[PDB]
């Protein structure tokens, strides 16, 4: 066939985690008994971009199991979990690209690959997704830059320069992740500079699942720049509350616990923003014995975090004797290599956030007469030169949880993917109102809270949750229906 | 000079307590400073509605030193706290209508009175502005308005307000009644009181979750009168008050009101939403094994997460210890589920009314035997089991009634919020157009102002705050100087 | 002396309900109570006790009483006494009690006294009690001091000068306590010579209860000065892990609550001293969102302090920037003028160890211009004259739980006076031992495991606590009785 | 090569392992600094069964420049990191007969290997250790059980009827265990049967690790058997204290983590046991959002647990509802294959008590058609044929943070350690005063409080912990000396 993975005898050991993680995973169990024989998605090209696990795998299985085709990549060169692409190439139900460890130019051509799908009326033609399931919005970045070249090409009918380019407006390297994107994006022009546009035609939407990805959705719609309708799965309460805090508050300590060898309990951990994520990673440190110490830029957050005991302070106050740093920021240049060089012999770095952008680690690896060393699998240890002294970095700063070990676990990853399921029978239930002779901009859209409350419901027998119902009149006196939902749009939850 | 409170020689204490508090309470010391020079209030008539701490004498000190003139009553017959009461009298800041174990009867007459403002002699007015908490100042408001609408339609006052049952027949809640009480006085001496007092009124300001229910159901109605403020819902007031400040402050309430030790007790908390999360909070830092009860199944999840028992209250109501209701709603627990309680069960609720415990059918059950155990602790005997139930303060807001409430810091951030909803209400009173029939809506305060109370606070705790550089502002999409979250971010 | 001085008997009602709802918690005593008042294994014994007289302690009393014995009553603090439970004694009849809230510190020492001081009927001579209950050592010390004192006055037939004198032997003022104890003892020099060697003769033991008691006890034992038998009940297992851990956990927080106006969340609140006490001040703190800073001078107590993730510092290095102080040492010195006068505006100060010592309340008191006032009933704010900065000190230094809330509630103390009982019972029953006529040396001991576990067992109940049952070949393989004990006599629990 | 490991090419990564470790395991640095040139070990013939991981590499290259000859051996089958292993190999410090995954067979001949020393006067001559580091007792246990062996041996001039029957006194089949270790005996009864009673002449002590191996060494003491001095190194404060409970609540975390997939949020996790292990599991299980329900047979340890907000219930009354069972207990039969017959779908079981024994793993695996399959590395999913539902076991029920993790972090192991370098050396100074033509009687001592004192000291600057020192007046009055001791020796910390 044509996917390409790591090890299709590992698949028997990813069908048995399957099942097992099924136990937990209610809400995609449930999905799959009430629509399996309706097939809601039948006829749909799912083109997915999220970290491969054994609880993906569920996902997939759900999408297929409702109708849709599906390719699939991991949105992390180090989140797959290899048993979990085996057992979907094994049972056929997608063609997987993706493996742990992949370079970053093998990252970029197997996101393009599950992006391609065969026309079957015409074995030269080539055809795009109908619907997109994004995680950090890398396919829909690839798509929307695909566009722009390709406008680009046709206007001086040529390769676009800052293709070739190795450096940035201002002079700077570019990333290796945006130079392997764009080696991608030539290809693809010299091949058929009508590839992406193409897409577009016959594309319904994407389901975004992570802040980060959702950030950038954000400030393409602003800007009358998003070309296909979104569904933002990360705001569902279910999702977000559940997710973000207590898949991390278990997950950071999984790849802390296999990254970093020593005990977390009295150290100075400092956790770099305190916003969903930041939250849970606190909560979870703090419950082995750490000190948290927590950064912040929005004062209503820092209230927070001091509320629940942490001291609130800029990264430079404690920089030299934090033994432990952890970025949950979602943004750039929040570690530098200047705040490295002060940092005690042997301080770990990490990050949780979606990008490794958070951490200047090219600035360090590039840091001249710097030396490196394997510690263990996905874990280093840099010397500056001057010094002598030693930091050690998780997984080369890609987030940590799912790069050290393997994510969330499959109760809340049930919560997350039970959205996405709901969210893609949107998007395709209502594809005939994607009318692009009318409209070529689109907005961003969440879940109705109806749907967030069924997806919370789903779950409660896992827990052995009883749940109270109101009486008519106690209905009538908060004013809400006995069968909700329960609060009101702007409700924080 | 009219003001109604119990003892003025506690003045002292309070004026004191007052300026310990200022320590905390950063956002009001602040706002004096930045504005008693201009007086952005100036002229303002201010009638509020809101349990008289020493937290809430800063505020109208606040408000006072913005120029307004004020007249204060509190929203419940347990909060008041009379040193607090009496530091305002003595300083001429306020005319206080307030006192700790007010009847019912005389809790309406108080706000009546807080309402009522003088102009000639025997000619009276209404206030310009209200600070409101739990509704009752607007309630009585608008309650009067529809009384005297119907009273000049028939010529006669309206039945219901003579009656003592409702629609089904049942008693009207003594609350109720005497508000009627008041209504009938006030219909018979002048009849167009509450509508004269609409022409001069620009806002009310309110202050928690049960109080924007009732905003919500007028909105809806096309009903509401006057412009809100939905102050409940500041980041920085929600997020801290209802959560942060009942973690403290129920505590402090059971540690008075019931003697015995919380660790390893089975407390039951109803209800787990803002108040309910804080409540669990602090039960289980003492040691105590808390089970929750919910309808909402997010937030029964929420507890889950939180290592809680999710039951209902029928599968655990023999074998708990300690029941908290924070919910919001009414019957949740009734005289059934409490003949049903271990002997020396306690009972207490920590949420805006009353009506969540059916006091009244336990008051008026045949053959009670009723002891008072000490203040505001009463102790009720089934006489068909010879089982006894303790219940806190008449089951009125246990942090309140049996405690002081929330401490300063969190009440300065609630507080803060109000004064910036006043001077909003206040500067934008000339686009009130009475005589257009205009809808009158609730309104939030802009995230700008939400986030600039929580960094007046900032320095109190010694939090040192990050600063963007303009790249990364411009990689996250947000100003430097914020706002940090879009509008539906949850905190 | 057979008349009651109380505060006012009127509240003796409001002080018996309180005891029967304290009485649910307090199973221990309920059944010493219904398993003795038969068979009364105390009675012809003359009780002296000098313990906190709260409703908790009127339940003990309650329990001596319906055991046979003859009781006097005295608190241990001049703060710690409830009223209505002193009123509920005198009331029913069943002790003679010299206690109210807020006594003068000469008035503490005639209560004491005069507790100590029983009819003789055979013409109308004093007689002393045969058994104490102390909490502190001060109905100990008094003893003590008061044969010394006697001893003294018959080498040259006078006064000795040391009770006269206002200062020690280094030149500095005696304390209040010292000065105030020594007038009683010149009193009753005066009246008798040979009052306290005369009690020696039908004195049988003592059972203390506390941490400072208890180091009292060992000082006298090691010098050989020890005049009669004692049971050290501090050291119960059912005593010191519950009472001055768990107990503090929550009396702490009441006794902040009430006098401190302040929130504690994000505040940084100093505990110094992470023994018994302190870890369960330490816990109560956290709960409620403080952020603790512990001071040690053990080692090991330091690094228990870390692991459960506070921050350990010299008071030096926080005593400028910290919120709240609170002193749970057992030593003296621990908080000087000095220091007060570097803390920050309005920063609070308490102490919850047995004795005011921890803080230099009267070098504050005494500071040339300081100026003081009463902010509240037993909470005062001192101001510096040259900063003008001021430090708010709860309840003079005396212990803060019992000070400004009502102490340890009925479980707990249930579990501590269950062991009370039990002690008294033993040294009563042992008697016949004491030889006054032989050069006998006295000692200190503890309470057997077996009774132990039984205050234990007495107790699960009331927390609804199922107990597993041992099968025989498993009491054999772990080498204990299936009735216990369970543990070695080394075990820390 | 003598040694008998997995992998000698894994010696880099555990080199660099043992320098990260080496970062935290401040105790055992100071012990090298400080006598390395002395070596007070110098001469001694040192055998450990103690799981071989880095940090154990840490205390073997202590001991070695320390002066010591060493041979050593894992106590698990499942516990050895073969990167540890190999790193004591290549640098030729000790001769190591250990793997992760042995066979029960190769365990005992690796121990038994490990125990073989070729003296130094003579290839051909066989003589043991002078000191075994033991940690379980089973070191100890085969020099006592091959003592026995040969005295039978000589009675009837034959091989024990006992070591070749595979049925005990009461016809139930007898572990694979003693099968395996009797095998190993009679092995060496046909070799020499004087092998073990030589070994006693030149054997000076043990010292005994965990509470397991301390009960073993009281029952041999309290019978009069014990052949050697020993040293309880469990007891320290320093080990019980730390590695028992702190070290189990991120390790415990770490195994389930690692073996079972499931979210430990919200559910009912069963902690069989609330000893010192089972406060730290607890501790680490509610940390992430698990709902503790507590089994004891002590009604102290239960009332502790209720005060930690715990539930506390008979197995049987929960069995049916729990998701997740973990043993604590150190005792046998505490889950019964009729216990995991009434278990819901997929719930998990595990034990970290020292032994299997905790629960029935051979009825379990011999249940009438039970079907087996690995799920994962060290984990089995078992299904029963009648009911068709199935359980997870971690790593056969042997403890799990080895078993399914690597056990303890280093800060906690160097504190363990640093204990056992200061018994063995307390072992060897001694060894003139073991006279076996006289004392024939030998007994168990624990380390001294100020050497206890003393490792605490040892690891405060790894945390930053500042200490407090008392003044003169303050030491004088707490009748203490300024250096310590500063706690009685019955203090329970
Ligand atoms: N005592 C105080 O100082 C204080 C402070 C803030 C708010 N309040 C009051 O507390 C109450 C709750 O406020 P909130 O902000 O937590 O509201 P909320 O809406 O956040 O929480 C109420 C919760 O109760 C649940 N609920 C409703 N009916 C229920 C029933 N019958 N059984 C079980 N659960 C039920 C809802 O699902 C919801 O999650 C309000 O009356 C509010 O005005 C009191
Ligand atoms: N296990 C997982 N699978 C997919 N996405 C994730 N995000 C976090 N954990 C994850
Ligand atoms: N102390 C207080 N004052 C006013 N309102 C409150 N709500 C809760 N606590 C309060
Ligand atoms: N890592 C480890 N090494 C040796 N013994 C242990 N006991 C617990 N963890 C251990
Ligand atoms: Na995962
Ligand atoms: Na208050
Ligand atoms: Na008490
Ligand atoms: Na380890």
Redesign the interface.
């Given at each position: 066939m044509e996917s390409r993975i790591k090890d299709i005898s590992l698949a028997e050991?990813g069908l048995?985690?399957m099942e097992?993680?099924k136990?937990?995973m209610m809400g995609l169990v449930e999905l799959q008994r009430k629509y399996r024989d309706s097939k809601p998605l039948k006829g749909a090209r799912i083109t997915g971009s999220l970290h491969l696990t054994?609880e993906t795998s569920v996902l997939v299985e759900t999408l297929y199991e409702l109708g849709a085709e599906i390719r699939w990549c991991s949105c992390n060169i180090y989140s797959t979990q290899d048993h979990a692409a085996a057992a979907l190439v094994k049972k056929n139900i997608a063609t997987v690209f993706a493996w742990k460890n992949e370079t970053i130019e093998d990252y970029w051509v197997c996101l393009n690959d599950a992006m391609t799908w065969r026309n079957p009326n015409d074995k030269d033609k080539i055809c795009g997704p109908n619907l997109i399931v994004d995680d950090g919005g890398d396919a829909t970045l690839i798509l929307h830059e695909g566009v722009k070249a390709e406008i680009e090409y046709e206007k001086y009918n040529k390769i676009p320069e800052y293709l070739e380019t190795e450096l940035d407006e201002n002079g700077k390297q570019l990333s290796m992740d945006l130079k392997c994107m764009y080696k991608v994006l030539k290809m693809e022009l010299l091949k058929n500079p009508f590839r992406w546009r193409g897409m577009l035609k016959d594309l319904y939407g994407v389901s975004e699942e992570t802040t980060t990805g959702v950030?950038r959705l954000?400030?393409m719609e602003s800007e009358g720049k998003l070309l296909l309708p979104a569904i933002n799965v990360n705001?569902s309460?279910?999702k977000?509350?559940?997710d973000n805090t207590?898949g991390c508050?278990?997950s950071l300590?999984?790849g802390l616990?296999?990254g970093c060898?020593?005990?977390?309990?009295?150290?100075?951990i400092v956790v770099l923003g305190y916003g969903e994520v930041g939250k849970g990673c606190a909560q979870?440190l703090?419950?082995?014995?750490?000190?948290?110490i927590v950064?912040?830029?929005?004062?209503?957050?820092?209230?927070?975090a001091?509320?629940?005991?942490?001291?609130?302070?800029?990264?430079e106050?404690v920089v030299s004797?934090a033994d432990i740093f952890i970025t949950a920021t979602?943004?750039?240049?929040?570690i530098t290599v200047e705040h490295m060089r002060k940092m005690k012999?042997?301080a770990y770095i990490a990050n949780i956030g979606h990008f490794d952008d958070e951490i200047d680690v090219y600035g360090l690896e590039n840091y001249p007469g710097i030396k490196v060393?394997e510690?263990?699998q996905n874990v280093h240890?840099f010397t500056f030169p001057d010094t002598q002294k030693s930091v050690?970095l998780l997984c080369k700063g890609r987030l940590v949880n799912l790069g050290c070990?393997?994510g969330?676990?499959?109760?809340?990853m049930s919560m997350s993917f039970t959205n996405q399921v709901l969210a893609q029978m949107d998007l395709w239930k209502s594809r005939e109102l994607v009318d692009r002779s009318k409209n070529t901009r689109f907005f961003v859209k969440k879940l109705s809270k109806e749907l967030?409350?069924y997806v919370?419901?789903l779950?409660?027998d896992?827990?052995?949750?009883?749940?109270?119902?109101?009486?008519e009149?106690?209905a009538k006196?908060?004013?809400v229906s006995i069968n909700?939902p329960?609060?009101?749009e702007?409700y924080?939850?």
């Open positions: 050991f048995q985690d097992i993680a136990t937990d054994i950030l954000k400030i705001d309460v279910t977000s509350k559940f207590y508050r278990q300590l999984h616990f296999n060898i020593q005990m977390l309990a009295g150290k100075k979870g703090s419950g082995v014995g750490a000190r948290v950064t912040e830029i929005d004062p209503i957050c820092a209230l927070q001091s509320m629940e005991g942490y001291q609130v302070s800029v990264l106050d004797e979602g943004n750039k240049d929040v012999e042997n060393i510690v263990k240890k050690i070990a393997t969330h676990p499959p109760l809340v967030d409350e919370a419901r779950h409660l896992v827990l052995g949750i009883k749940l109270t119902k109101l009486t009149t106690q006196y908060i004013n909700g329960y609060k009101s702007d924080r939850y």
